[PDB]
Design a protein around this nucleic acid. Structure first.
Ligand SMILES: [Mg+2]
Ligand SMILES: [Mg+2]
Ligand SMILES: [Mg+2]
Ligand SMILES: [Mg+2]
Ligand SMILES: [Mg+2]
Ligand SMILES: [Mg+2]
Ligand SMILES: [Mg+2]
Ligand SMILES: [Mg+2]
Ligand SMILES: [Mg+2]
Ligand SMILES: [Mg+2]
Ligand SMILES: [Mg+2]
Ligand SMILES: [Mg+2]
Ligand SMILES: [Mg+2]
Ligand SMILES: [Mg+2]
Ligand SMILES: [Mg+2]
Ligand SMILES: [Mg+2]
Ligand SMILES: [Mg+2]
Ligand SMILES: [Mg+2]
Ligand SMILES: [Mg+2]
Ligand SMILES: [Mg+2]
Ligand SMILES: [Mg+2]
Ligand SMILES: [Mg+2]
Ligand SMILES: [Mg+2]
Ligand SMILES: [Mg+2]
Ligand SMILES: [Mg+2]
Ligand SMILES: [Mg+2]
Ligand SMILES: [Mg+2]
Ligand SMILES: [Mg+2]
Ligand SMILES: [Mg+2]
Ligand SMILES: [Mg+2]
Ligand SMILES: [Mg+2]
Ligand SMILES: [Mg+2]
Ligand SMILES: [Mg+2]
Ligand SMILES: [Mg+2]
Ligand SMILES: [Mg+2]
Ligand SMILES: [Mg+2]
Ligand SMILES: [Mg+2]
Ligand SMILES: [Mg+2]
Ligand SMILES: [Mg+2]
Ligand SMILES: [Mg+2]
Ligand SMILES: [Mg+2]
Ligand SMILES: [Mg+2]
Ligand SMILES: [Mg+2]
Ligand SMILES: [Mg+2]
Ligand SMILES: [Mg+2]
Ligand SMILES: [Mg+2]
Ligand SMILES: [Mg+2]
Ligand SMILES: [Mg+2]
Ligand SMILES: [Mg+2]
Ligand SMILES: [Mg+2]
Ligand SMILES: [Mg+2]
Ligand SMILES: [Mg+2]
Ligand SMILES: [Mg+2]
Ligand SMILES: [Mg+2]
Ligand SMILES: [Mg+2]
Ligand SMILES: [Mg+2]
Ligand SMILES: [Mg+2]
Ligand SMILES: [Mg+2]
Ligand SMILES: [Mg+2]
Ligand SMILES: [Mg+2]
Ligand SMILES: [Mg+2]
Ligand SMILES: [Mg+2]
Ligand SMILES: [Mg+2]
Ligand SMILES: [Mg+2]
Ligand SMILES: [Mg+2]
Ligand SMILES: [Mg+2]
Ligand SMILES: [Mg+2]
Ligand SMILES: [Mg+2]
Ligand SMILES: [Mg+2]
Ligand SMILES: [Mg+2]
Ligand SMILES: [Mg+2]
Ligand SMILES: [Mg+2]
Ligand SMILES: [Mg+2]
Ligand SMILES: [Mg+2]
Ligand SMILES: [Mg+2]
Ligand SMILES: [Mg+2]
Ligand SMILES: [Mg+2]
Ligand SMILES: [Mg+2]
Ligand SMILES: [Mg+2]
Ligand SMILES: [Mg+2]
Ligand SMILES: [Mg+2]
Ligand SMILES: [Mg+2]
Ligand SMILES: [Mg+2]
Ligand SMILES: [Mg+2]
Ligand SMILES: [Mg+2]
Ligand SMILES: [Mg+2]
Ligand SMILES: [Mg+2]
Ligand SMILES: [Mg+2]
Ligand SMILES: [Mg+2]
Ligand SMILES: [Mg+2]
Ligand SMILES: [Mg+2]
Ligand SMILES: [Mg+2]
Ligand SMILES: [Mg+2]
Ligand SMILES: [Mg+2]
Ligand SMILES: [Mg+2]
Length: 247
RNA sequence: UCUUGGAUUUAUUGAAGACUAACUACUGCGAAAGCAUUUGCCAAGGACGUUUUCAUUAAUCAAGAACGAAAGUUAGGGGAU
RNA sequence: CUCGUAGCGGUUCUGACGUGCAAAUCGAUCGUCGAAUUUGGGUAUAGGGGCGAAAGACUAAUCGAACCAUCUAGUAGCUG
RNA sequence: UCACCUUGACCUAUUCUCAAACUUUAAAUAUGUAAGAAGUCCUUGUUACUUAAUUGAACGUGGACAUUUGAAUGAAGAGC
RNA sequence: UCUUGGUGGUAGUAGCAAAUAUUCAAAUGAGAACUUUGAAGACUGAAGUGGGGAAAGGUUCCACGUCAACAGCAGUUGGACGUGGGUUAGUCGAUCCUAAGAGAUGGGGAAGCUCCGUUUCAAAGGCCUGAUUUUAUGCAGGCCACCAUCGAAAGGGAAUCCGGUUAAGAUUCCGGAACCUGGAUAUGGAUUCUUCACGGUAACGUAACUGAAUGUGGAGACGUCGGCGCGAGCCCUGGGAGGAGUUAUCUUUUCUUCUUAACAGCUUAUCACCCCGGAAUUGGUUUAUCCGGAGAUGGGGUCUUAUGGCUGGAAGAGGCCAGCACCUUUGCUGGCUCCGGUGCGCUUGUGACGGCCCGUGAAAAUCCACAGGAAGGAAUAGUUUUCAUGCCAGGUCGUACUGAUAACCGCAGCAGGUCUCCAAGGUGAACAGCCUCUAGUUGAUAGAAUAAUGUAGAUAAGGGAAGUCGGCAAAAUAGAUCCGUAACUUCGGGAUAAGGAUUGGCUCUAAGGGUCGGGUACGAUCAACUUAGAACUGGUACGGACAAGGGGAAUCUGACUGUCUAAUUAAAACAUAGCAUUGCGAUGGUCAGAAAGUGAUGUUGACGCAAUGUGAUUUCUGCCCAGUGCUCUGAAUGUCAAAGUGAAGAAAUUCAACCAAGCGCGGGUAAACGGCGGGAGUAACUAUGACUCUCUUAAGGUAGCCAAAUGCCUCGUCAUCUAAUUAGUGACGCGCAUGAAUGGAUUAACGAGAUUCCCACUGUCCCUAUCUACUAUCUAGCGAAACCACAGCCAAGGGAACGGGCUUGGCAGAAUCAGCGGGGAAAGAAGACCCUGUUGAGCUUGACUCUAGUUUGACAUUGUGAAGAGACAUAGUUUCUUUACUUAUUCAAUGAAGCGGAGCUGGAAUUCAUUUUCCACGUUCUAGCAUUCAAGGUCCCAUUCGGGGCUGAUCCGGGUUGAAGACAUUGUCAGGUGGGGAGUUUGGCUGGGGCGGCACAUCUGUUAAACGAUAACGCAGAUGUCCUAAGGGGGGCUCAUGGAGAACAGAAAUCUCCAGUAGAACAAAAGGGUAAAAGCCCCCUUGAUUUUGAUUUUCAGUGUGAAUACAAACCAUGAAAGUGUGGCCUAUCGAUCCUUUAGUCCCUCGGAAUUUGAGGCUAGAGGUGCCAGAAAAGUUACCACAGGGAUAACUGGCUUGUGGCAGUCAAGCGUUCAUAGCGACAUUGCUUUUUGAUUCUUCGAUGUCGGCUCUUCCUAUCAUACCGAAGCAGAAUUCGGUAAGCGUUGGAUUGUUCACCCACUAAUAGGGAACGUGAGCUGGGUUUAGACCGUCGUGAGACAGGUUAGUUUUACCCUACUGAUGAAUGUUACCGCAAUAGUAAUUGAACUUAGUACGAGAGGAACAGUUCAUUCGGAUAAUUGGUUUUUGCGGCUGUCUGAUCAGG
């Protein structure tokens, strides 16, 4: 008869993002006349590390078209982008790694990252370390493009949506083992309070639907409907098949 | 088992990975295991030719090493048959 | 990582004490001691709620549901 | 044996022993009613009941009988 | 156990015992253990008992006066009491900045208190003018796109130091010496006829050396560890100038002073950089291997000023002395204050590096610089001066003190807790322990004595775990050097494995450094502590105190480090990395919120986030989709709500069709929940059973493992371990009930985890003794509490069954002291177990009823066109179908910046004399720059040295832009889902409750004892039906059965007679009843009918059911008398409310009617079986409350099935012979220690088993003493008597009592004492809360199943006991007596008797006598051992007193 840990996370008290040391919001450059009819030239000045993020951040500096001043955008760095590199964003831009072009104006099989789901929302797809997006199709009348997402799914996005050529840098990170609870401690120190995890079967029945009994056992089926609510969605939510993938 | 929710067939267009028929032989190369679509680059190899050059530098070899079908092992990728 | 101080804990004596020095101490013996360490201040989360490396533990000596006031002189086939 | 010492039960007359859910009989104790005036007797009045029929039935008028008026003991007042 | 207040006994009692410790004298005083001073002894021992601070306190600080209360003794003292004094800032903080966050406004939500949000969807605004005469500087240009405010006395930050001063303030006052900010402002210097400096190749330099808007850059501004370098301070030390100490002797000796601030000038640097040069024969170089043609080495330079040196500050101050004054105002005078060395030292700061990260380690205020060139400006210095000097001001608040064994919190002057800075010498590795210096304290009620029992510390002969549940506690080990070091292993470890030597002192030896140097075959000089070796030496001591690992072989278990039940559970539980599963591509997953123009994840984006499971590595994860969950573009007349449609009706209404989700159907999923079998026969053994035959499966437990922490039986069986093992280990396995991510098996290392063994070791024990300190005791002072009906000597009896009192006995003499744990079923706590309650709570679910949320349908928002297998058959915008518009709505973005359309060219437009037609719009080697309405061009001005347009830069539409679109979304309603959340329910009787049953509503016979009534979970049975006849009537007939007779035919077919009192039948149990019937056969029928009363039984003379007699009818029936109101009689059944039906066509619908419709009256039905009648699933070991001995266990008491022990009788056994010794079939008793029955007492609690310890009692006698009997020759036995005097063991396993074995013994008898004995212990067993396993349940949970951990309180009161005093007897003293009470010894062996008696032999005694021993007891200390504060003597370490001696 007590609210469970998965419910308490939505109140957002001790379960927020530890966001002091982060370098900003890693977004694309705001879609304007420079990036819609020609291009604009940037410059990388730093490849910095983002706290809580496994991918480096490239600080790319552009000139403001309308006022004499410099605008520093923060990109997710692509593997191969270096400091001192000129970076081109726009429609008429050239395909190099780190250039920002619409999905329509890049050919089939192009490998892109920081890809907008809608034109101008400043980067939503292929942002974690190592991941990328492959363009697998085009429908030039009623401009759309078919992609493969990092999950393996197929998405249809506007051809006016943008992307950055290359993979997101920092790949192969999760292939290293953490080896100890300490290295898990400092990974989640700079993300959010989701660590450690107590098993619900290791509890009292007031705390979890899995807890209690004279032996640690689940009692009911762990697969719960999508048509259930909070407090019952403690287990496998809306599972199609369970266990190993052996047919 | 699939099938009137149109299977099987047929046509158009795509993807994926694998494979490289026919030509293909009492034919070739490779130390052996093995090796076939093209073009490019890389270093190599046999045989021939030689009025070149060195002039026994060689033969086989314990111990020791390189390579070693396929299945298998570990971890990524890929999963068309 | 280890031996071991400061520190931080609390194994055993089932030691002392048990109208105590103390509503949890004292002593010896112990765990650990460069990190998932220890800690001050600021700050956030509030009661059927929080918080929980999970013991129904902790949330002002109060916790299988805090504390305060009211409804309330709640009701009692039960005891005085 | 192919009417026989070595037949079983059955029938008839005997015999020993018994019965809470057997009995011809049958106590003790306990128990119902009666021992009168709201009585008995005579005459005959009523009725739609009853009879073949004032016959019966029931309730009566009038008349006969007075405390040994219908066993014993008691009664402390009786009844409501 | 009332309330409030007061008061006692206990009681002058318990006690005032941690933190080494006090002592002498004087002073003050009424009074001194405690005050003050001196002396002495000591301690904290620099991670302090020392100097400061943060929080908190608040005056506690300081002085004077004072001692009533407070300082648990005292008090002249005080943190007390009374009166006062005291806190000084431009520089230290606050103030300011932002952090995590908090929070207004605009705006949205909410009935509202108010909520969200912090830049949002807002018309959110101040900044300078170049510089002043029409300026209160605007009535002007020009610029800026953010958007409150709060948030740190530890973060960021402008600037102050030294000396002195107070009773108490100080980085604040005073004296001296600075600095910063803000403002104003003059002079000098600088620069200027080249108008905004010069020098250097350069790095850069300087005293200056204009610089607007705008932009850019830097600082503020950052982790941790390691080593190295450098600095400061400290420590160590040499020479000298003073002062003090010791001085028998020694000591050029021991201690001590010898200082230099902020600020300023000049110099000072690793790193970095510049020039020259051009490198392999590669060089440079760090402790640490980096660097160099992208230019090393080298030679010259440049810069940062951490930091150091010099000088100013500043010797005038501070220190140390000396001399002279000597109520001198109170000083005056004078000298010295100097020069070094050393370093793996300590603390700290810094610099250059290196290591680490799936961790890469704040922000803002603020300040500066540069880019740019706006504007302004030149005479002998026009401007401008970030150069020097000069002037003024710096507010408000805080400041004292403590910061804790007395200033804070803990009730308080509480051994507790509470953040931080500084940190001397020695020993030593050390911030350890031990001793000392500076500083500080010497506070804690005392004195005397040295009983017991304690607490704390010790030691112990011989043995060495025999102790105990268990090695608990203790001992042992310990530092360092050298040697040596296994199994196993994840190859990193194990590991300090195990083991084994050495260690002092003194005198030496040998290595190991720095600075100094060459010709266009060389040693002066200084300094450090490591290491190795040698000799000599000694009561063979030496890590001499201190400090400091015990180790080994196994098993279980968790990989490890880590975490938790504060205050009983530290673990095997939790976590963990690793592994795996699941969901989600943002209009999203998971979750918030009452809503929201609302939130978390999210400053996010599948290498992510969320939800779970398992838990490192090795090696594996078998079989199951039937169940239930989950899931599926799956089947579409099975079910399908609301809305909508249609039919009938006057209509309310009734019906029908259509019918979304969801359910049902089909499938997939087990690292989802979960599951993983019998009977029988078979191999040339007897059973065993590869294979085989069936029953049911979805699958029938695979790989593995095991009496395992999982196995009841079980202490399984074997082996091993031991003398002996219910332990352990290894095997085996039909395994009650093992098993694969509810993970199976194994696994190095780790572990305050659990278990067994071994070595060492020891007082754990045999078996106890001694010592010290503190208590206790006694004294002065001070002085509680628990508890208390009244109390306090027993035996027996009875009694609510264990009496202090009552009864009958025993007896009994003041007042007491120390102990003590028998008793007071002592106290502590209105039992926490069990029961009762129509008492609650928590958690679970296939209980009931809801509910948020979610899903599905409908209507509104919701408009505009189409095509329309979209109306019913010249027939119509809505209709069981799709896509077209944008303006509602929705999403998103931006400083709403470039949208839409139209306009120049050139063509593979082969211009088709037409853009039917389309395409490109100033930027891509490179880490530069991009700003001033834009220069140019053009035209105008009224031209003023400047100003304005246009074009540069196409025109038009004012639609910011992109999606999405009348669908989501939203409002309302309807169906589903919905233990996530809520509330409620879970009967009773009961030889306690649970379970079973119904004795819960009934019937017959018995119980039941001759009217009636009468209990038990008494007994034997039956009831919830059956019947249109098995009801009613009439007539006829006799039934069960037996005997004899009939072909098949018998023992049983039909037929016939005789006998048949019922021995048959009557629906169903049993009892009763019945023979021209009540039965059997036949005929007719519905009385099993209507209406109202009366009555009987159960009984309240209520109801219900059943029944009896009538009466009014109407029928049946029979010839009729009659009979029939269901069954031959005794059982077979049901209220109010609601619904329904029959009847009358009756009453009413209240303004009056008609018609439906509704309501009403009388009689039935539908039902409550718990049967006088609620609508209801579990568990609780987390439980709780009101009670209850109305109630379970332990004890006592009764009873005595059972257990044991006896007896009578004697068929028989005992070679004959009942009774030497036995004894059947019977029979009569005893015990309460075994086990069973009462719930008698106890629930405002009698502390629950075993053990240990210790006492007493019984006798039903094992031994010992003395005897009797024998089938007693002897020896040894057996049976029996008197007898409880005296003994009655040590161990392995087990928590066990019991058991069992080993072994000794004279013997290892049995019992009682609240199953003797917990204020005597222990806590192993059992009995809370943690945890794991097995079985069972969907689960919560359960198990008189296993395993691990889990606080044991109080005596000082009375009595009892043990010891100790004592009034009274004329006083006093010595010597005695003995009533009464207690009593104590015990047992064995050997020699001799004696190889004798006896015996055929084998064997083989006893009495007397001597000598020893066992167990016990009482002493005693010559000896032997133990003990040591004799601190007696000696030795040793470390430190301290200068050394020595002598000591602490
Ligand atoms: Mg976990
Ligand atoms: Mg738990
Ligand atoms: Mg080919
Ligand atoms: Mg460690
Ligand atoms: Mg350790
Ligand atoms: Mg420690
Ligand atoms: Mg503990
Ligand atoms: Mg204790
Ligand atoms: Mg350590
Ligand atoms: Mg601390
Ligand atoms: Mg809640
Ligand atoms: Mg629990
Ligand atoms: Mg409360
Ligand atoms: Mg009350
Ligand atoms: Mg009877
Ligand atoms: Mg009678
Ligand atoms: Mg009192
Ligand atoms: Mg006393
Ligand atoms: Mg004393
Ligand atoms: Mg000391
Ligand atoms: Mg006092
Ligand atoms: Mg006094
Ligand atoms: Mg004072
Ligand atoms: Mg300051
Ligand atoms: Mg502020
Ligand atoms: Mg900081
Ligand atoms: Mg000063
Ligand atoms: Mg001048
Ligand atoms: Mg100059
Ligand atoms: Mg700067
Ligand atoms: Mg200063
Ligand atoms: Mg420090
Ligand atoms: Mg100046
Ligand atoms: Mg002050
Ligand atoms: Mg002060
Ligand atoms: Mg102070
Ligand atoms: Mg005090
Ligand atoms: Mg020292
Ligand atoms: Mg030393
Ligand atoms: Mg003391
Ligand atoms: Mg000894
Ligand atoms: Mg000895
Ligand atoms: Mg023993
Ligand atoms: Mg021990
Ligand atoms: Mg060594
Ligand atoms: Mg060793
Ligand atoms: Mg070992
Ligand atoms: Mg562990
Ligand atoms: Mg575990
Ligand atoms: Mg494991
Ligand atoms: Mg640990
Ligand atoms: Mg605890
Ligand atoms: Mg957020
Ligand atoms: Mg499995
Ligand atoms: Mg409907
Ligand atoms: Mg043992
Ligand atoms: Mg075993
Ligand atoms: Mg075996
Ligand atoms: Mg087994
Ligand atoms: Mg004493
Ligand atoms: Mg009395
Ligand atoms: Mg008597
Ligand atoms: Mg009493
Ligand atoms: Mg009396
Ligand atoms: Mg009497
Ligand atoms: Mg007596
Ligand atoms: Mg006395
Ligand atoms: Mg005592
Ligand atoms: Mg007692
Ligand atoms: Mg008690
Ligand atoms: Mg009741
Ligand atoms: Mg815009
Ligand atoms: Mg009777
Ligand atoms: Mg019967
Ligand atoms: Mg019945
Ligand atoms: Mg008849
Ligand atoms: Mg019958
Ligand atoms: Mg009968
Ligand atoms: Mg009845
Ligand atoms: Mg009712
Ligand atoms: Mg009306
Ligand atoms: Mg009843
Ligand atoms: Mg009571
Ligand atoms: Mg006797
Ligand atoms: Mg005897
Ligand atoms: Mg005898
Ligand atoms: Mg006796
Ligand atoms: Mg005796
Ligand atoms: Mg005995
Ligand atoms: Mg007992
Ligand atoms: Mg006792
Ligand atoms: Mg225990
Ligand atoms: Mg006790
Ligand atoms: Mg006492
Ligand atoms: Mg001596």
């Amino acid at each position: 008869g007590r609210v469970i840990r998965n419910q308490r996370k939505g109140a957002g008290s001790i379960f927020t993002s530890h966001t002091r040391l982060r370098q900003g919001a890693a977004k694309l450059r705001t879609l304007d006349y420079a990036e819609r009819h020609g291009y604009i030239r940037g410059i990388v000045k730093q490849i910095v590390h983002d706290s809580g993020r496994g991918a480096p951040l490239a600080k790319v500096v552009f000139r403001d078209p309308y006022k004499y001043r410099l605008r520093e955008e923060i990109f997710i760095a692509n593997e191969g982008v270096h400091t001192g590199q000129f970076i081109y964003a726009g429609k008429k831009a050239s395909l190099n790694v780190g250039n920002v072009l619409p999905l329509g104006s890049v050919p089939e099989g192009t490998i892109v990252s920081n890809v907008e789901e809608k034109p101008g929302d400043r980067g939503a797809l292929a942002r974690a370390s190592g991941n990328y997006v492959i363009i697998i199709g085009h429908n030039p009348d009623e401009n759309k493009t078919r992609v493969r997402l990092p999950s393996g799914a197929k998405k249809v996005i506007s051809s006016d949506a943008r992307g950055v050529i290359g993979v997101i840098a920092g790949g192969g990170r999760v292939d290293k083992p953490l080896l100890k609870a300490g290295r898990a401690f400092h990974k989640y120190r700079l993300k959010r309070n989701s660590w450690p995890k107590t098993r619900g079967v290791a509890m009292n029945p007031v705390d979890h639907p899995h807890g209690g009994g004279n032996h640690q056992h689940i009692g009911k089926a762990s697969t719960i409907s999508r048509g259930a609510v909070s407090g019952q969605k403690a287990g496998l939510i809306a599972a199609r098949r369970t266990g190993l993938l052996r047919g």
